[PDB]
């Protein structure tokens, strides 16, 4: 019904941050805070260590890339940056990863009317 | 010794599969079975927003090179396979223990060397 749909929209678009590790190369990762809302995705350190800030309208996709075990999953976020697709990869435990992938797709899917 | 090394040359083109990690975008690994014989090289991966891994089949006559990329410990080594696919060179990276890796690299290069 209308209450449940509104509540799910609030809940998927509210800002929420997640402690994940960003993967620069095979086994070279840094710990980050990944902040996601309906308006922006931000990546801040807890190789480039300048914060990253992406307008949510420049996001393209967010997919699960590998789930190893309940405690190790990797996902890939794709966005536009000065006219090219870039990919960021992060890993965390599998429940966290699945929550993040669903939240980002729920925001991509909400753009249509 | 010499006769085991000659047995390995004799059997170099026979089918053998290895359980190794394929490295994706120089960032993470997934587990594959890498089947190698003188006929071809196959990579077969061993959940609604899931990046699908398609099986890869390469005719051995499109292989170009197989090179140890680095050896970290006895426990981690990485090799690179290069091949021609629709007119471009493609490169795949795999890692496993050093013993497995050295065995694959030798086997693939015996296969490339036997062209004649």
């Amino acid at each position: 019904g209308a209450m449940a749909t509104v509540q799910d929209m609030l809940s998927s678009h509210h800002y929420k941050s997640f402690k994940v590790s960003m993967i620069h190369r095979l086994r070279f990762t840094t710990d980050v805070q990944l902040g996601i809302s309906g308006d922006k995705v931000e990546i801040d350190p807890v190789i480039k260590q300048k914060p990253i800030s992406i307008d949510s309208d420049l996001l393209c996709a967010c997919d699960l890339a590998e789930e190893k075990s309940p405690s190790h999953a990797i996902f890939k976020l794709t966005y536009l940056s000065n006219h090219d697709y870039k990919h960021l990869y992060f890993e965390s435990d599998a429940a966290t990863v699945n929550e993040i992938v669903l939240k980002v797709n729920y925001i991509l899917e909400s753009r249509a009317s």
Side-chain angles (χ1 to χ4, degrees), chain A residues 1-47 49 51-113:
Chain A
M3 290 280 284
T5 291
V6 179
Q7 183 175 36
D8 282 339
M9 217 44 66
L10 286 181
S11 152
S12 69
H13 297 54
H14 277 161
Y15 175 79
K16 188 165 178 173
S17 71
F18 297 89
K19 288 163 223 194
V20 291
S21 56
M22 182 163 176
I23 304 168
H24 315 280
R25 10 170 113 59
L26 187 50
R27 304 187 164 76
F28 176 29
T29 67
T30 58
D31 289 332
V32 295
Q33 178 190 51
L34 168 62
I36 303 172
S37 71
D39 294 323
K40 248 191 253 172
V41 167
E42 285 159 317
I43 296 143
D44 290 282
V46 298
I47 211 85
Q49 328 240 1
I52 296 151
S53 177
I54 303 160
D55 278 14
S56 64
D57 283 358
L58 289 177
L59 292 172
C60 305
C62 186
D63 286 302
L64 181 65
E66 216 336 56
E67 200 194 294
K68 278 164 178 130
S69 64
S71 62
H72 185 165
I74 301 156
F75 70 95
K76 185 202 228 238
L77 175 68
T78 305
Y79 67 106
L80 278 174
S81 179
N82 196 33
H83 325 299
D84 289 316
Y85 295 126
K86 319 253 95 130
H87 312 283
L88 294 167
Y89 301 82
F90 302 91
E91 51 186 25
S92 196
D93 71 274
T96 296
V97 165
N98 179 260
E99 176 179 5
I100 290 170
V101 172
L102 294 184
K103 179 173 182 72
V104 179
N105 278 291
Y106 203 113
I107 293 168
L108 296 173
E109 292 162 7
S110 295
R111 306 163 163 178
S113 73

